């Protein structure tokens, strides 16, 4: 239902191919959802450089998952400007992979320290996107959902749907009854299983 959808603009996949997505059992799947502007969608990938891939959301190089992004100008656009989707503009070091940093401490860009008060060389790290309906493509909101597939030693909790077919009786047919492989003739019986 995800691969066959058409509204998705970018559906590049890295560790797995979309064809065999259903035939792969994973321990856990993480769905990370955020909204970024159009030009920054290229930075959501393993081994990429940018403000949105160093200060906000960083993907590890050994990434086993998919990235899905679709334009949402209609969903997120205010006549005066959204002013509600914000990104971390200033940080003193790059993020570790799959790390979330939520802090409002003032970025000290000068010699004189500031004790949480803005001023000269002391700026708020968090800045707000300006989203407006009149904005052209590339500065328009894009909703990104990053699916990360995890494979631990725990039993594979998530598996793809197991399709089947109809039941034919009184005929020598091959059968696969929930993992039992064999050949024979299936007839109704009066055995009383527990």
């Amino acid at each position, epitope marked *: 239902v995800l691969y066959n959808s058409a509204s998705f603009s970018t559906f590049k996949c890295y560790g797995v191919s979309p064809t065999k997505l259903n035939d792969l059992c994973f321990t856990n799947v993480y769905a990370d959802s955020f909204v970024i502007r159009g030009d920054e969608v290229r930075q959501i990938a393993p081994g990429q*450089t*940018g*403000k*949105i891939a*160093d200060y906000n959301y960083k993907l590890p190089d050994d990434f086993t998952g998919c990235v899905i992004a679709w334009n949402s100008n209609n969903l997120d656009s205010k006549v005066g*400007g959204n002013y509600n989707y914000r990104y971390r*503009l200033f940080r*003193k*070091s*790059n993020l570790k992979p799959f790390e979330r940093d939520i802090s409002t401490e003032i970025y000290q*860009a*000068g*010699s004189k320290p500031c004790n949480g008060v803005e001023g*000269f*060389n002391c*700026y*708020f790290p968090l*800045q*707000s996107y*300006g989203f*407006q309906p009149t904005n052209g493509v590339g*500065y328009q909101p894009y909703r990104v959902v990053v699916l990360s597939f995890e494979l631990l030693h725990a039993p594979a909790t998530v598996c793809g749907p197991k399709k089947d077919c109809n039941l034919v009786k009184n005929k020598c047919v091959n059968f696969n009854f929930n993992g039992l492989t064999g050949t024979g003739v299936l007839t109704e019986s009066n055995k009383k299983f527990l």
Partner: antibody
Amino acid sequence: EVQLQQWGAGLLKPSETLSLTCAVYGESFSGYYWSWIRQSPGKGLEWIGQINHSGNTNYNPSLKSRVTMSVDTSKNQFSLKLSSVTAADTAVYYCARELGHDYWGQGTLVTVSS
Amino acid sequence: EIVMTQSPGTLSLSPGERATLSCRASQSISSSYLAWFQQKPGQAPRLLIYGASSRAPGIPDRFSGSGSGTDFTLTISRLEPEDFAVYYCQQYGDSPLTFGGGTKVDIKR
């Protein structure tokens, strides 16, 4: 009050690499971002990139595939390496703080011509 | 990459006369994060206004800035002799720092 002194080859030839180095004196060198800013005639000031003591680098998207900074924490120095300089790289290069608000460099004119 | 544009290419006003500058940007600045630089010939640029409204330390009160959104103005009340240089404007509310095209002021006669 830091002193930013820089040196580098003031003349170059096409298809060569450009190497500049800026030295930080006075206040602490770690816990900060150091920028390289280029001022070309005709055009305006352009921000090339940033680097800190741990080697974390920010790049200008235009000059992304040809710009590489390196840092030397031992002697409090950072450097710029611009590869494959052409005739359009003739400009004046400055080294400053992260945003170039407090202190700047001196200005190293670099001309590329064969 | 917010393209930054300055409308007056070459302002020419007599000494001791008020001067106004424009730094029309291509987008809306994040939190009025726009500054004004001054570059005397042969030297490095120096700040005059930070945050589009407040003066940097050590800057004389003759410099004043205003404007918000996508229009910013720099006002010099009195044109002192040590004021005729090129003025650049810089923004922060985007990943690449962008400088203005640069405008110069000279003595009128």
